[PDB]
Here is the input.
Amino acid sequence: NRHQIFNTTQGHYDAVSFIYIPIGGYMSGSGVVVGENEILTNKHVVNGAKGNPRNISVHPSAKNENDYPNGKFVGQEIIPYPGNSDLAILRVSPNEHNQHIGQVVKPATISSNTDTRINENITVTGYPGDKPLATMWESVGKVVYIGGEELRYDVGGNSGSPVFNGKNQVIGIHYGGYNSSVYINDFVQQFLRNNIPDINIQ
Amino acid sequence: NRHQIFNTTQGHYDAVSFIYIPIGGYMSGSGVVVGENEILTNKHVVNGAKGNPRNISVHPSAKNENDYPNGKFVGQEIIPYPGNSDLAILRVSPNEHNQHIGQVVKPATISSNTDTRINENITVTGYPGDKPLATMWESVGKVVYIGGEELRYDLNSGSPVFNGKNQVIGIHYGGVDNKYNSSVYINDFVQQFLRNNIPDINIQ
Here is the structure.
């Protein structure tokens, strides 16, 4: 069961990011900082901006609706994964202090996924839409399926949430659905390397 | 002879560490990361901080004065070797990212020294003071004397002495000019001192 995170800027939680996109309302979602100016999230999240990346606000380490400890970063370029998975890179502008999103937080470590196997314990950490706005929540779960670019795990996760292994490395990006995530396999990794030259794959 | 190391974060070089201590000036020495929060260096290097470990800055895999690719870790506790040898452990605090020094580089392997013999080829690798600041250099040499805690070789303070397997067999501390270089030999007594203080020490 889910537990709220309160020290959102400490340890591996600081790269977990809250996404806000206005529309007669708003869509929210989750993502994870992975590069100097880059986060990962879903295609169906960035699609909410209707082609206009500056409609997307990204709040790394957001703690609640009135506590954005790292401010916000506005989207600059949407880079969707060419393959048929719910993955996109969002490139964000520097903030109103000309700091870079990869400088105010530590970019997450991506897992090579050489050791990832079913029955492994994982966590999914992000901003569930059934909780107060921009509150970070971590759920514990178990990998139950790995195939191609699909990784399923064993309640629900918020669109774009990073999936972490026991080493606090990102093994996948939750996209919906058991729960489904985008498995960061070799093809996904090369996509990341092609676009995020400082990507940290361990 | 001796050659500059440029890819200081690759292979066994990443644990080699540059040490900076302000004193109307500064003193610089060398050391080697051997645990999660621990480096080995000389007594006469840590003595430069005048009792205050926070005066010591440790830069693992330092490449030059303007290039510290693994940043800096600040001294937290000085642990001298109880015996009469120029050896100290420096425990360092986490960095501003709360990373431990043994997580940012691979801690060096220590030699059990069961096979170490005279005439064996070794390297001495560190940050000599006759070279530009924080530049790492490797020096090839030959063991000529082993006795007690004393290991001497032909060819600096705190530089690890590596065998052919890239294991640390000693910690350079000096010598007598035009005669021999001296290191602290990591013998069974030194080895046990390391175990008593460095939980994750790696001796092979």
